[PDB]
mmCIF file of all heavy atoms in Angstrom:
data_model
loop_
_atom_site.group_PDB
_atom_site.id
_atom_site.type_symbol
_atom_site.label_atom_id
_atom_site.label_comp_id
_atom_site.label_asym_id
_atom_site.label_seq_id
_atom_site.Cartn_x
_atom_site.Cartn_y
_atom_site.Cartn_z
ATOM 1 N N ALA R 312 0.826 -1.203 -0.004
ATOM 2 C CA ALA R 312 0.002 -0.001 -0.005
ATOM 3 C C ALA R 312 0.859 1.253 0.002
ATOM 4 O O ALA R 312 0.553 2.236 -0.683
ATOM 5 C CB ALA R 312 -0.936 0.002 1.207
ATOM 6 N N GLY R 313 1.975 1.226 0.752
ATOM 7 C CA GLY R 313 2.836 2.389 0.826
ATOM 8 C C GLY R 313 3.401 2.798 -0.519
ATOM 9 O O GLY R 313 3.528 3.993 -0.811
ATOM 10 N N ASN R 314 3.759 1.817 -1.351
ATOM 11 C CA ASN R 314 4.242 2.146 -2.690
ATOM 12 C C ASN R 314 3.173 2.848 -3.504
ATOM 13 O O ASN R 314 3.449 3.808 -4.227
ATOM 14 C CB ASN R 314 4.717 0.882 -3.402
ATOM 15 C CG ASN R 314 6.037 0.379 -2.862
ATOM 16 O OD1 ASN R 314 6.789 1.120 -2.211
ATOM 17 N ND2 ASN R 314 6.344 -0.892 -3.121
ATOM 18 N N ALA R 315 1.919 2.379 -3.398
ATOM 19 C CA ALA R 315 0.825 3.099 -4.035
ATOM 20 C C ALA R 315 0.653 4.490 -3.443
ATOM 21 O O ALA R 315 0.363 5.456 -4.156
ATOM 22 C CB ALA R 315 -0.475 2.300 -3.896
ATOM 23 N N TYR R 316 0.820 4.606 -2.121
ATOM 24 C CA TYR R 316 0.728 5.911 -1.476
ATOM 25 C C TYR R 316 1.735 6.891 -2.066
ATOM 26 O O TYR R 316 1.399 8.027 -2.398
ATOM 27 C CB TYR R 316 0.926 5.769 0.029
ATOM 28 C CG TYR R 316 1.218 7.073 0.738
ATOM 29 C CD1 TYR R 316 0.177 7.894 1.180
ATOM 30 C CD2 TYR R 316 2.511 7.500 0.971
ATOM 31 C CE1 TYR R 316 0.436 9.082 1.813
ATOM 32 C CE2 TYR R 316 2.775 8.684 1.616
ATOM 33 C CZ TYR R 316 1.730 9.479 2.030
ATOM 34 O OH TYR R 316 1.988 10.665 2.674
ATOM 35 N N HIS R 317 2.992 6.462 -2.193
ATOM 36 C CA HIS R 317 4.010 7.343 -2.740
ATOM 37 C C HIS R 317 3.742 7.664 -4.207
ATOM 38 O O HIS R 317 4.010 8.776 -4.666
ATOM 39 C CB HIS R 317 5.394 6.713 -2.576
ATOM 40 C CG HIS R 317 5.871 6.690 -1.153
ATOM 41 N ND1 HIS R 317 6.221 7.817 -0.456
ATOM 42 C CD2 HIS R 317 6.065 5.646 -0.303
ATOM 43 C CE1 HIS R 317 6.591 7.484 0.765
ATOM 44 N NE2 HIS R 317 6.518 6.176 0.882
ATOM 45 N N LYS R 318 3.205 6.702 -4.959
ATOM 46 C CA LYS R 318 2.896 6.938 -6.371
ATOM 47 C C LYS R 318 1.891 8.071 -6.527
ATOM 48 O O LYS R 318 2.112 9.016 -7.287
ATOM 49 C CB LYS R 318 2.386 5.659 -7.016
ATOM 50 C CG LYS R 318 1.962 5.826 -8.472
ATOM 51 C CD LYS R 318 1.535 4.505 -9.087
ATOM 52 C CE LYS R 318 1.105 4.672 -10.519
ATOM 53 N NZ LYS R 318 2.207 5.207 -11.380
ATOM 54 N N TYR R 319 0.766 7.989 -5.805
ATOM 55 C CA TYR R 319 -0.303 8.978 -5.950
ATOM 56 C C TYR R 319 -0.096 10.207 -5.088
ATOM 57 O O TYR R 319 -0.801 11.195 -5.283
ATOM 58 C CB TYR R 319 -1.646 8.331 -5.610
ATOM 59 C CG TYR R 319 -2.012 7.227 -6.562
ATOM 60 C CD1 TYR R 319 -1.983 5.887 -6.174
ATOM 61 C CD2 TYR R 319 -2.390 7.506 -7.874
ATOM 62 C CE1 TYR R 319 -2.307 4.880 -7.054
ATOM 63 C CE2 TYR R 319 -2.712 6.510 -8.766
ATOM 64 C CZ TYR R 319 -2.675 5.194 -8.347
ATOM 65 O OH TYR R 319 -3.005 4.192 -9.216
ATOM 66 N N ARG R 320 0.863 10.186 -4.156
ATOM 67 C CA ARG R 320 1.151 11.387 -3.377
ATOM 68 C C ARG R 320 1.566 12.535 -4.287
ATOM 69 O O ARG R 320 1.320 13.697 -3.967
ATOM 70 C CB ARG R 320 2.239 11.093 -2.350
ATOM 71 C CG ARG R 320 2.464 12.218 -1.358
ATOM 72 C CD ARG R 320 3.618 11.928 -0.401
ATOM 73 N NE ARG R 320 4.867 12.531 -0.839
ATOM 74 C CZ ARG R 320 5.808 11.922 -1.546
ATOM 75 N NH1 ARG R 320 5.698 10.643 -1.895
ATOM 76 N NH2 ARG R 320 6.901 12.593 -1.897
ATOM 77 N N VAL R 321 2.199 12.224 -5.419
ATOM 78 C CA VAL R 321 2.705 13.237 -6.340
ATOM 79 C C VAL R 321 1.854 13.335 -7.603
ATOM 80 O O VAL R 321 2.260 13.966 -8.569
ATOM 81 C CB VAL R 321 4.174 12.975 -6.714
ATOM 82 C CG1 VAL R 321 5.061 13.059 -5.471
ATOM 83 C CG2 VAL R 321 4.328 11.614 -7.386
ATOM 84 N N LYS R 322 0.663 12.710 -7.609
ATOM 85 C CA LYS R 322 -0.248 12.821 -8.745
ATOM 86 C C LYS R 322 -1.493 13.608 -8.408
ATOM 87 O O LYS R 322 -1.739 14.676 -8.994
ATOM 88 C CB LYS R 322 -0.630 11.416 -9.250
ATOM 89 C CG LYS R 322 0.424 10.749 -10.109
ATOM 90 C CD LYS R 322 -0.004 9.326 -10.462
ATOM 91 C CE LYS R 322 0.955 8.677 -11.459
ATOM 92 N NZ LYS R 322 0.885 9.305 -12.796
ATOM 93 N N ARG R 323 -2.293 13.134 -7.448
ATOM 94 C CA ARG R 323 -3.551 13.783 -7.076
ATOM 95 C C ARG R 323 -4.151 12.978 -5.928
ATOM 96 O O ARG R 323 -3.663 11.902 -5.590
ATOM 97 C CB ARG R 323 -4.522 13.891 -8.244
ATOM 98 C CG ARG R 323 -4.974 12.556 -8.804
ATOM 99 C CD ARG R 323 -5.485 12.673 -10.235
ATOM 100 N NE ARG R 323 -4.439 13.098 -11.151
ATOM 101 C CZ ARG R 323 -3.534 12.272 -11.686
ATOM 102 N NH1 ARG R 323 -3.522 10.984 -11.423
ATOM 103 N NH2 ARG R 323 -2.613 12.777 -12.515
ATOM 104 N N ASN R 324 -5.243 13.512 -5.361
ATOM 105 C CA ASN R 324 -5.878 12.910 -4.186
ATOM 106 C C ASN R 324 -6.967 11.941 -4.666
ATOM 107 O O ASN R 324 -8.158 12.232 -4.652
ATOM 108 C CB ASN R 324 -6.444 13.985 -3.285
ATOM 109 C CG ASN R 324 -7.087 13.427 -2.040
ATOM 110 O OD1 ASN R 324 -6.832 12.298 -1.647
ATOM 111 N ND2 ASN R 324 -7.931 14.236 -1.399
ATOM 112 N N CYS R 325 -6.524 10.750 -5.066
ATOM 113 C CA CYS R 325 -7.434 9.716 -5.569
ATOM 114 C C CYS R 325 -7.238 8.354 -4.905
ATOM 115 O O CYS R 325 -7.902 7.393 -5.302
ATOM 116 C CB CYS R 325 -7.259 9.547 -7.077
ATOM 117 S SG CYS R 325 -5.598 9.039 -7.585
ATOM 118 N N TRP R 326 -6.347 8.250 -3.921
ATOM 119 C CA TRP R 326 -6.025 6.986 -3.285
ATOM 120 C C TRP R 326 -5.953 7.202 -1.777
ATOM 121 O O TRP R 326 -5.457 8.233 -1.334
ATOM 122 C CB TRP R 326 -4.676 6.463 -3.796
ATOM 123 C CG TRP R 326 -4.291 5.100 -3.304
ATOM 124 C CD1 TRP R 326 -4.479 3.907 -3.944
ATOM 125 C CD2 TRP R 326 -3.622 4.784 -2.077
ATOM 126 N NE1 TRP R 326 -3.990 2.880 -3.198
ATOM 127 C CE2 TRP R 326 -3.451 3.382 -2.034
ATOM 128 C CE3 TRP R 326 -3.154 5.552 -1.001
ATOM 129 C CZ2 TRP R 326 -2.839 2.731 -0.962
ATOM 130 C CZ3 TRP R 326 -2.552 4.903 0.060
ATOM 131 C CH2 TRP R 326 -2.387 3.509 0.066
ATOM 132 N N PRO R 327 -6.443 6.247 -0.956
ATOM 133 C CA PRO R 327 -7.118 4.991 -1.322
ATOM 134 C C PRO R 327 -8.546 5.198 -1.789
ATOM 135 O O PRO R 327 -9.077 6.302 -1.646
ATOM 136 C CB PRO R 327 -7.085 4.194 0.002
ATOM 137 C CG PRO R 327 -6.216 4.963 0.938
ATOM 138 C CD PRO R 327 -6.294 6.375 0.496
ATOM 139 N N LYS R 328 -9.152 4.155 -2.330
ATOM 140 C CA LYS R 328 -10.538 4.202 -2.801
ATOM 141 C C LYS R 328 -11.411 3.331 -1.894
ATOM 142 O O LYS R 328 -11.063 2.182 -1.617
ATOM 143 C CB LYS R 328 -10.648 3.700 -4.240
ATOM 144 C CG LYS R 328 -9.911 4.555 -5.248
ATOM 145 C CD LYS R 328 -10.350 4.238 -6.675
ATOM 146 C CE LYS R 328 -9.545 4.997 -7.689
ATOM 147 N NZ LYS R 328 -8.118 4.565 -7.684
ATOM 148 N N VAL R 329 -12.521 3.899 -1.444
ATOM 149 C CA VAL R 329 -13.489 3.181 -0.620
ATOM 150 C C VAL R 329 -14.599 2.685 -1.542
ATOM 151 O O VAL R 329 -15.112 3.445 -2.371
ATOM 152 C CB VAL R 329 -14.052 4.072 0.490
ATOM 153 C CG1 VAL R 329 -15.088 3.325 1.314
ATOM 154 C CG2 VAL R 329 -12.911 4.567 1.378
ATOM 155 N N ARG R 330 -14.962 1.418 -1.392
ATOM 156 C CA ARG R 330 -16.000 0.833 -2.235
ATOM 157 C C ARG R 330 -17.370 1.391 -1.873
ATOM 158 O O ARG R 330 -17.684 1.592 -0.704
ATOM 159 C CB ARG R 330 -15.993 -0.688 -2.090
ATOM 160 C CG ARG R 330 -14.717 -1.328 -2.642
ATOM 161 C CD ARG R 330 -14.598 -2.803 -2.238
ATOM 162 N NE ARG R 330 -14.487 -2.973 -0.800
ATOM 163 C CZ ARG R 330 -15.464 -3.434 -0.014
ATOM 164 N NH1 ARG R 330 -16.636 -3.806 -0.495
ATOM 165 N NH2 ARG R 330 -15.236 -3.525 1.299
ATOM 166 N N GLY R 331 -18.189 1.624 -2.911
ATOM 167 C CA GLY R 331 -19.516 2.167 -2.669
ATOM 168 C C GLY R 331 -20.382 1.261 -1.825
ATOM 169 O O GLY R 331 -21.141 1.703 -0.963
ATOM 170 N N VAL R 332 -20.286 -0.066 -2.043
ATOM 171 C CA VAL R 332 -21.085 -1.012 -1.280
ATOM 172 C C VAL R 332 -20.727 -0.983 0.205
ATOM 173 O O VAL R 332 -21.495 -1.508 1.019
ATOM 174 C CB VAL R 332 -20.928 -2.436 -1.845
ATOM 175 C CG1 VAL R 332 -21.575 -2.545 -3.212
ATOM 176 C CG2 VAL R 332 -19.453 -2.842 -1.912
ATOM 177 N N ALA R 333 -19.593 -0.394 0.578
ATOM 178 C CA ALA R 333 -19.229 -0.248 1.967
ATOM 179 C C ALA R 333 -19.757 1.037 2.590
ATOM 180 O O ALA R 333 -19.609 1.238 3.804
ATOM 181 C CB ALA R 333 -17.706 -0.296 2.128
ATOM 182 N N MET R 334 -20.368 1.917 1.794
ATOM 183 C CA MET R 334 -20.902 3.177 2.273
ATOM 184 C C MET R 334 -22.359 3.016 2.660
ATOM 185 O O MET R 334 -22.986 1.966 2.475
ATOM 186 C CB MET R 334 -20.757 4.269 1.220
ATOM 187 C CG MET R 334 -19.338 4.436 0.689
ATOM 188 S SD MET R 334 -19.220 5.698 -0.590
ATOM 189 C CE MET R 334 -17.457 5.679 -0.922
ATOM 190 N N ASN R 335 -22.913 4.078 3.222
ATOM 191 C CA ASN R 335 -24.337 4.129 3.530
ATOM 192 C C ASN R 335 -25.116 4.658 2.326
ATOM 193 O O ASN R 335 -24.535 5.299 1.435
ATOM 194 C CB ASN R 335 -24.581 5.021 4.742
ATOM 195 C CG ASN R 335 -23.901 4.473 5.990
ATOM 196 O OD1 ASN R 335 -24.033 3.299 6.322
ATOM 197 N ND2 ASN R 335 -23.160 5.330 6.692
ATOM 198 N N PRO R 336 -26.425 4.404 2.266
ATOM 199 C CA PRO R 336 -27.207 4.879 1.103
ATOM 200 C C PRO R 336 -27.113 6.376 0.868
ATOM 201 O O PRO R 336 -27.175 6.812 -0.277
ATOM 202 C CB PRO R 336 -28.633 4.459 1.448
ATOM 203 C CG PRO R 336 -28.491 3.334 2.388
ATOM 204 C CD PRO R 336 -27.232 3.579 3.176
ATOM 205 N N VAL R 337 -26.957 7.162 1.929
ATOM 206 C CA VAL R 337 -26.988 8.621 1.789
ATOM 207 C C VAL R 337 -25.940 9.100 0.794
ATOM 208 O O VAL R 337 -26.138 10.094 0.111
ATOM 209 C CB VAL R 337 -26.808 9.282 3.175
ATOM 210 C CG1 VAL R 337 -25.415 8.998 3.728
ATOM 211 C CG2 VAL R 337 -27.054 10.787 3.083
ATOM 212 N N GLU R 338 -24.796 8.406 0.715
ATOM 213 C CA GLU R 338 -23.651 8.901 -0.053
ATOM 214 C C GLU R 338 -23.259 8.049 -1.238
ATOM 215 O O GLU R 338 -22.248 8.353 -1.886
ATOM 216 C CB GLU R 338 -22.444 9.055 0.878
ATOM 217 C CG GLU R 338 -22.022 7.756 1.564
ATOM 218 C CD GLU R 338 -21.955 7.884 3.067
ATOM 219 O OE1 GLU R 338 -21.837 9.019 3.577
ATOM 220 O OE2 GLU R 338 -22.009 6.842 3.755
ATOM 221 N N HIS R 339 -23.997 6.980 -1.569
ATOM 222 C CA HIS R 339 -23.676 6.233 -2.773
ATOM 223 C C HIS R 339 -24.851 5.365 -3.164
ATOM 224 O O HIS R 339 -25.510 4.786 -2.294
ATOM 225 C CB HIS R 339 -22.436 5.350 -2.567
ATOM 226 C CG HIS R 339 -21.709 5.024 -3.830
ATOM 227 N ND1 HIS R 339 -22.093 3.996 -4.664
ATOM 228 C CD2 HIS R 339 -20.630 5.607 -4.423
ATOM 229 C CE1 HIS R 339 -21.286 3.961 -5.713
ATOM 230 N NE2 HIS R 339 -20.391 4.913 -5.576
ATOM 231 N N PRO R 340 -25.152 5.233 -4.461
ATOM 232 C CA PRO R 340 -26.256 4.334 -4.872
ATOM 233 C C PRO R 340 -26.063 2.891 -4.439
ATOM 234 O O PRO R 340 -27.057 2.183 -4.230
ATOM 235 C CB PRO R 340 -26.267 4.484 -6.404
ATOM 236 C CG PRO R 340 -25.648 5.788 -6.666
ATOM 237 C CD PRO R 340 -24.600 5.967 -5.605
ATOM 238 N N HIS R 341 -24.821 2.441 -4.318
ATOM 239 C CA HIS R 341 -24.546 1.056 -3.921
ATOM 240 C C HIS R 341 -24.584 0.850 -2.414
ATOM 241 O O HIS R 341 -24.457 -0.294 -1.961
ATOM 242 C CB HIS R 341 -23.166 0.626 -4.437
ATOM 243 C CG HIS R 341 -23.075 0.591 -5.935
ATOM 244 N ND1 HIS R 341 -21.934 0.151 -6.577
ATOM 245 C CD2 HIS R 341 -23.958 0.915 -6.898
ATOM 246 C CE1 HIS R 341 -22.130 0.222 -7.888
ATOM 247 N NE2 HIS R 341 -23.354 0.681 -8.105
ATOM 248 N N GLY R 342 -24.759 1.907 -1.611
ATOM 249 C CA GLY R 342 -24.673 1.776 -0.171
ATOM 250 C C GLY R 342 -25.893 1.121 0.453
ATOM 251 O O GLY R 342 -26.960 0.999 -0.152
ATOM 252 N N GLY R 343 -25.716 0.683 1.693
ATOM 253 C CA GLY R 343 -26.800 0.168 2.491
ATOM 254 C C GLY R 343 -27.041 -1.325 2.318
ATOM 255 O O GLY R 343 -26.347 -2.026 1.576
ATOM 256 N N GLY R 344 -28.058 -1.797 3.021
ATOM 257 C CA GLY R 344 -28.450 -3.195 2.996
ATOM 258 C C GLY R 344 -27.802 -4.006 4.106
ATOM 259 O O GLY R 344 -26.686 -3.730 4.548
ATOM 260 N N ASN R 345 -28.535 -5.017 4.555
ATOM 261 C CA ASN R 345 -28.009 -5.903 5.610
ATOM 262 C C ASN R 345 -26.927 -6.832 5.092
ATOM 263 O O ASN R 345 -26.298 -7.535 5.889
ATOM 264 C CB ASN R 345 -29.161 -6.704 6.228
ATOM 265 C CG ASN R 345 -30.081 -5.840 7.060
ATOM 266 O OD1 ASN R 345 -29.732 -4.733 7.448
ATOM 267 N ND2 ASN R 345 -31.264 -6.366 7.336
ATOM 268 N N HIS R 346 -26.713 -6.887 3.782
ATOM 269 C CA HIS R 346 -25.552 -7.533 3.189
ATOM 270 C C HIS R 346 -24.905 -6.544 2.230
ATOM 271 O O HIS R 346 -25.582 -5.690 1.654
ATOM 272 C CB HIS R 346 -25.924 -8.816 2.425
ATOM 273 C CG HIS R 346 -26.535 -9.876 3.286
ATOM 274 N ND1 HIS R 346 -25.790 -10.769 4.022
ATOM 275 C CD2 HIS R 346 -27.834 -10.193 3.515
ATOM 276 C CE1 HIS R 346 -26.593 -11.589 4.674
ATOM 277 N NE2 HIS R 346 -27.841 -11.257 4.373
ATOM 278 N N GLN R 347 -23.593 -6.667 2.057
ATOM 279 C CA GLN R 347 -22.888 -5.839 1.077
ATOM 280 C C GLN R 347 -23.189 -6.378 -0.318
ATOM 281 O O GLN R 347 -22.688 -7.434 -0.703
ATOM 282 C CB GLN R 347 -21.388 -5.832 1.352
ATOM 283 C CG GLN R 347 -20.977 -4.907 2.496
ATOM 284 C CD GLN R 347 -19.488 -4.658 2.541
ATOM 285 O OE1 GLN R 347 -18.771 -4.894 1.574
ATOM 286 N NE2 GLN R 347 -19.010 -4.174 3.675
ATOM 287 N N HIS R 348 -24.022 -5.647 -1.055
ATOM 288 C CA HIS R 348 -24.384 -6.037 -2.418
ATOM 289 C C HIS R 348 -24.931 -4.808 -3.126
ATOM 290 O O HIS R 348 -25.445 -3.890 -2.495
ATOM 291 C CB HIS R 348 -25.424 -7.154 -2.431
ATOM 292 C CG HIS R 348 -26.793 -6.735 -2.002
ATOM 293 N ND1 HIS R 348 -27.928 -7.049 -2.699
ATOM 294 C CD2 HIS R 348 -27.195 -5.986 -0.929
ATOM 295 C CE1 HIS R 348 -28.978 -6.531 -2.085
ATOM 296 N NE2 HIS R 348 -28.561 -5.897 -1.011
ATOM 297 N N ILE R 349 -24.787 -4.799 -4.459
ATOM 298 C CA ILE R 349 -25.208 -3.643 -5.237
ATOM 299 C C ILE R 349 -26.727 -3.504 -5.213
ATOM 300 O O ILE R 349 -27.265 -2.411 -5.009
ATOM 301 C CB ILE R 349 -24.662 -3.738 -6.672
ATOM 302 C CG1 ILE R 349 -23.137 -3.889 -6.628
ATOM 303 C CG2 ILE R 349 -25.050 -2.503 -7.478
ATOM 304 C CD1 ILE R 349 -22.454 -3.748 -7.972
#
């Protein structure tokens, strides 16, 4: 992960990426549900 961190540290703020299915419905169409699923 650290190598990826150094790579994108000098590119832009795009890493790490959080999966939508791990979010709540308020902030992503894939969020929510009693199981992680789209």
Side-chain angles (χ1 to χ4, degrees):
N314 287 340
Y316 165 86
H317 289 291
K318 177 177 180 60
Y319 296 108
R320 189 183 96 264
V321 298
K322 281 176 174 291
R323 63 202 64 82
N324 182 19
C325 61
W326 185 96
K328 297 195 185 65
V329 178
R330 294 169 297 106
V332 291
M334 307 178 177
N335 298 311
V337 66
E338 59 234 340
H339 205 278
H341 296 183
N345 290 342
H346 299 276
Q347 282 193 17
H348 71 133
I349 304 191

